[PDB]
């Protein structure tokens, strides 16, 4: 079949894995978080690109795409412009995405997918994780720079 996640996305996902592993010091858990994120992105993409959503689900998915776009733009801007980062804004955007994803797949998928969604967002939407990622530490700042470079390319190309 075709490759469903491109190289730029894979680099972003790897950097998200690296900050998650730095934050938790649990390589297995960090791998599980990132694999669950990938699995849900792939499932959502298969249903979306092959026209499997009904009208209500499609409204939810388009809302999800708009929220993700806002999240991506905000994440990049909070990295670029000093003294603008707000962990509550990021956490709230992420939890909006979580809820819309739960709703979009509620008819197609089961509790296992809801658990994958919650496992991912419980980590990434955590306010202390976000404040550490955007904080003064050199390791986090270097990874965040790579994340934002990749996200900016995805935004520019139209994939976020
Ligand atoms: C602060 C750290 C938090 C980040 C981690 C949690 C955030 C996860 C939330 C959202 C990320 C998932 C977004 C995928 C949305 C998929 C919906 C749908 O399948 O989109 C379709 C597929 O399009 C895509 O490009 C897929 C989207 C990218 C997939 C790979 C993304 C990996 C995750 C990157 C990081 C997420 C953003 C981070 C923002 C801080 C639309 O297709 P099209 O534009 O019509 O044409 C074909 C595209 N070449």
From Swiss-Prot:
Single GO biological process annotation from the record: negative regulation of TOR signaling
Keyword set includes Phosphoprotein: no
Subcellular location: Cytoplasm
GO CC annotation terms, alphabetical: cytoplasm
Residues of the full protein shown: 31 to 186 of 186
Organism this protein belongs to: Danio rerio (Zebrafish)
Protein name in the entry: Tumor necrosis factor alpha-induced protein 8-like protein 1
Family recorded in the similarity comment: Belongs to the TNFAIP8 family.
Predominant cellular place of this UniProt entry's protein: cytoplasm
Disulfide bond sites: none
Coiled coil (residue ranges): 11-44
Keyword line: Coiled coil, Cytoplasm
